[PDB]
Design a protein around this ligand. Sequence first.
Ligand SMILES: O=C(O)CNC(=O)C(=O)O
Ligand SMILES: [Mg+2]
Ligand code: NI
Ligand SMILES: [Zn+2]
Length: 331
Amino acid sequence: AQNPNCNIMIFHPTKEEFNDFDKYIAYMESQGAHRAGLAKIIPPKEWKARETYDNISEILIATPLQQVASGRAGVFTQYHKKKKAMTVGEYRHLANSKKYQTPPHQNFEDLERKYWKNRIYNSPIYGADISGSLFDENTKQWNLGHLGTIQDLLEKECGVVIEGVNTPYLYFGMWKTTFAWHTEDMDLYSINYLHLGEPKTWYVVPPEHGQRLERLARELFPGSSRGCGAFLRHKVALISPTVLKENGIPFNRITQEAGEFMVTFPYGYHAGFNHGFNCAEAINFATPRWIDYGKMASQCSCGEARVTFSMDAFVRILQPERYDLWKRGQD
Ligand SMILES: O=C(O)CNC(=O)C(=O)O
Ligand SMILES: [Mg+2]
Ligand code: NI
Ligand SMILES: [Zn+2]
């Protein structure tokens, strides 16, 4: 088996290899990339997502989210307080303010230490889940707004036609902005392009050891766990590398920089944080290998996780038994 230790692999495709998205994904998986739950793809030096980012201030962040933490430094939940709309310009200015800016630090490692030590005592503001794209339409390779859709994949593989669409989202981050421990909706893949700004650090549990993470989470958030059989779908829980190491949870970490893609793989739990002002674009996608993961994916039926229009049809076709009870949580 390739990559038996489930290490995060880093790919350096040539521009020739960068033309066929699906085939390169299959290539990475032939080399065992998926076992880690996360891979890094450095685009060819000739490739550009767009000409410049000169004009992005005028994007509106309709509902910025203030990420308020509770608990201890290594084990905390966050809640998202809705704030008033602001432009990307205003957000960038806020990110650079003294209150919110990245502190002085020696290197990524020192910054990571400060993140995990000090996260809970601050409440950064995240512009997350903004429908849109920053890829130039003339970018033909690895354009997150022009991927084949999950609905089209489901149709090619299983012959069924469903409603739904699948479009990218932008994320505007600042120092300490956090994405909690999760897998994708329906345990899909995700792909994330860091367009500009400061880095994003990622942590990931190998898909084959996902249940160990879940087991630890039930022990760390025992009431959340009683309330919902798939409470990690709420995307609120954080567990530090230290606490994962202490409980024998296998994981890896890696830092994504501006200009780099990350792909999460089916059932690869991930979490992370931003080093400073940045902008990422991400979208879910599927492959033939996804289909069984989609059939086995846990669902939030407590009603917190409250997910997309398009997810209805995935659950209805792949999880027809769950479909009656799941939609009661989604209605
Ligand atoms: O970038 C973020 O804040 C969160 N992104 C993801 O969880 C992802 O791309 O799968
Ligand atoms: Mg603009
Ligand atoms: Ni994700
Ligand atoms: Zn729930």
